[PDB]
Amino acid sequence: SEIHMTGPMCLIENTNGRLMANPEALKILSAITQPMVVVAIVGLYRTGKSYLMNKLAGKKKGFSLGSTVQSHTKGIWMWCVPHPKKPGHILVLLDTEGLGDVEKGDNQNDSWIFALAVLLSSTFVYNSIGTINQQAMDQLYYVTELTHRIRSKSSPDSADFVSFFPDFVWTLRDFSLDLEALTPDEYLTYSLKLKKGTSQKDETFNLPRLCIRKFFPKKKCFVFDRPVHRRKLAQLEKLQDEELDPEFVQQVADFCSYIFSNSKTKTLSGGIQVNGPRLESLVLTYVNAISSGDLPCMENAVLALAQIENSAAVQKAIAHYEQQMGQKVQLPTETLQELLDLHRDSEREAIEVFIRSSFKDVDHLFQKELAAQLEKKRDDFCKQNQEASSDRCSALLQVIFSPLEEEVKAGIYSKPGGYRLFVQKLQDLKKKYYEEPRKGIQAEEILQTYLKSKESMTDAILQTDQTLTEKEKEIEVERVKAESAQASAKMLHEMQRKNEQMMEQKERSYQEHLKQLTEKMENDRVQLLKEQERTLALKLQEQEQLLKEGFQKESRIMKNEIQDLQTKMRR
Amino acid sequence: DPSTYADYFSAWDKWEKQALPGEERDEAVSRLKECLINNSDELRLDRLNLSSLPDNLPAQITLLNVSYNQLTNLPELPVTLKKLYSASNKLSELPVLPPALESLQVQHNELENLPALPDSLLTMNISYNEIVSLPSLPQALKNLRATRNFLTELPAFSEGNNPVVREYFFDRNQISHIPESILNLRNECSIHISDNPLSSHALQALQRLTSSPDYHGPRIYF
Ligand SMILES: Nc1nc2c(ncn2[C@@H]2O[C@H](COP(=O)(O)OP(=O)(O)O)[C@@H](O)[C@H]2O)c(=O)[nH]1
């Protein structure tokens, strides 16, 4: 089940004013089983981000201008190749078709293309051309729209972004400046410094830096070298590139060696290792929220993904129960506790299969639907048990008592001593019936319901066989009325105990449900705490950096944003 | 009456040497050189850190792209211009447009007022500016994009007789009133006015007006 994409395909296209997801890209997505490390390379028009993507996979010693004969006017590209350094994961490469109204306008919705690349990625790469400056932090205005573009939780905002946003990576195209004091990371931090003041120009220029600092957990910077020919367009040459990349290929082979060994696998709330179908539901639920006129929320996207994998976890749970019972149930069951114990054992494993493959079942509606379907399976297994027990005990009668049905038909037992010899043979036949093995639970009912139907013949032998006293000394026909009374009593006394045992199981099953769900919800709160502790350790990582670098004006507003989390962590 | 080749290079080599730091006027010259000689219709000067374009643009071009720069004011434009690409700059006002222009890309600027609009205009985008009122609206103009702005009115000016039109955008503004010149248009128009604080009585005056046999009315979105 390995995949190596044969040329980057369009994922979502920006056409005629809206977005329309490429179905062929979603089809190959649903076929990817392995987890994904998604690296998104965003950039403006002709920002030179192609020689990165075509290297992040390793097409050749450079790729010949990618593919310009098919420039689908769009917003996003994808390219999925196997990850070289992480064995089981799949390395996914994202890219923008190029913003900035190049051949068509419609950059109206460009602010979504940026936010979409943030939500979909695990490592965020942004390509600009050199010397991060006023003109650069103005073109990065998409990060200013994020506070109104997306939301973390849904109502029946921007504080939680740092918890799930990817790591910002700024590739500076054609810069390689020899500004003696610094290192590329020290430049990205020096550029991200603010200007103290209360003017509208101070806030308008410190705002894009606050976003790129408060919203992203990790930050790493890289630079380019740009061959010496200042007029050459996309010249297809790898040896003329070897004469044009002395310390350039050393920058790109180091940049890719960092992305390979330091980019994290794409995760969601709860350690959800995002894979093909999960990423498929992600992009689908996000664009369909955009085109419908709402803002995309990461909570609604992971809940819609839950509704997909929870119902699928129920079917795998139901099917595992059917596989177990099919190989275990030996119909007809000897007792009822044998069947109910064989049920709760295979019921336990059915719950286990659901727990491990489900996540955030809202109100546990998917778990209670499983328990409702499991109780239906519980009932018809007892009804098939009754049908199996009765259909054998009845066949026992047609083979044990049918000889006696011919001895009476032939006239025997109608003679001196006929009654006492018929009863003695019936006491023997009722014994051979009780001695036959694996009868079931309906053995007592089917026998008595057959004797009470042949009582006319047990009576007709009486008043036919004189033999002795009779006629007012018929003690053995009121004795018969006594047996058919105590038999119809212990049968009702067992229909009680049978109905009792079903309520014993209706509770031992419910206790197993609340037991496994307890351990799941326990480890659910355990993970959320660790996720909040990391999110807290990073919001304090940036408040201390505002006190350290002078700005106590923003450290206080950071403390305001942090004390809001302290109260929301509780309830 | 028109300039010569030697006249162009002199004023360009002069404009080249008044080079602010980082400002890529050297490449823009070798493009303006390359533009004039082949008489090509396209002039692309995008993302060159240009704060002021020279007053002498080749009057033979028809497509001009100077977007993504620090332009404050733009020089006089050749009458032979069809498409105008200048977005994400610091423009304060616009020179009077050529009568042969068809498209106008000026979004993400600091404009507050607009000069006259030629009837040859078919599409334009003027979002992310600070305009309040607007000049004449051409007859064939169909695609307006005035989302991010300070506008408070929409005097939809008329011409001879306007046939079928297209979608206009006025979301995220402070219009606060719909003139019936909007309602006069038939049911083939599109007018998006989302996130505009409207009048209290006019908020429901259009709701009950459109939930009716309003076959003779334009589609309103908010
Ligand atoms: N400035 C610069 N341009 C490059 C570099 N490598 C490739 N290019 C050019 O950049 C273009 C690709 O830009 P791209 O990131 O795909 O932007 P897009 O085409 O708008 O999506 C190609 O035509 C290349 O010739 C580089 O290192 N620096």
Numbering used by the authors:
A (entry chain B): 3 to 158, 167 to 191, 196 to 585
B (entry chain A): 19 to 240
Which sentences from the paper describe this structure?
IpaH9.8 is one of the most well-studied members of the IpaH family and is secreted by Shigella flexneri during infection. IpaH proteins function as E3 ligases and subvert the host UPS pathway to suppress the host inflammasome and innate immune responses. Recently, it has been reported that IpaH9.8 targets human guanylate-binding protein 1 (hGBP1) for ubiquitination and degradation in order to suppress host defense in cells. In this study, we illuminated the key role of the LRR domain in autoinhibition of IpaH9.8 and revealed that IpaH9.8 can be activated by its LRR domain through substrate binding.
Crystals were obtained for the complex of the IpaH9.8 LRR domain and the full-length hGBP1, and the structure of the IpaH9.8LRR–hGBP1 complex was determined at 3.72 Å. The complex crystals belong to a space group P6122 and contained one heterodimer in each asymmetric unit. However, the IpaH9.8LRR–hGBP1LG-MD structure lacks a GDP molecule that was observed at the catalytic center of the LG domain in the IpaH9.8LRR–hGBP1 complex. In the IpaH9.8LRR–hGBP1 complex, the guanine-cap was visible and revealed a similar orientation to other nucleotide-bound structures of hGBP1, and the phosphate-cap was also visible but flipped compared with other nucleotide-bound hGBP1 structures. In addition, the α12 of the hGBP1-GED domain in IpaH9.8LRR–hGBP1 rotated ~10° with respect to hGBP1-apo (right). Indeed, in the IpaH9.8LRR–hGBP1 complex, the Glu147 of hGBP1 formed hydrogen-bond interactions with the Arg166 of IpaH9.8LRR (top), triggering main chain conformational changes in Arg166 and two other adjacent residues. Altogether, these results demonstrated that substrate-binding induced conformational changes in LRR-CT, which resulted in destabilization of the hydrophobic cluster and LRR-CT, which could disrupt the LRR–NEL interaction.
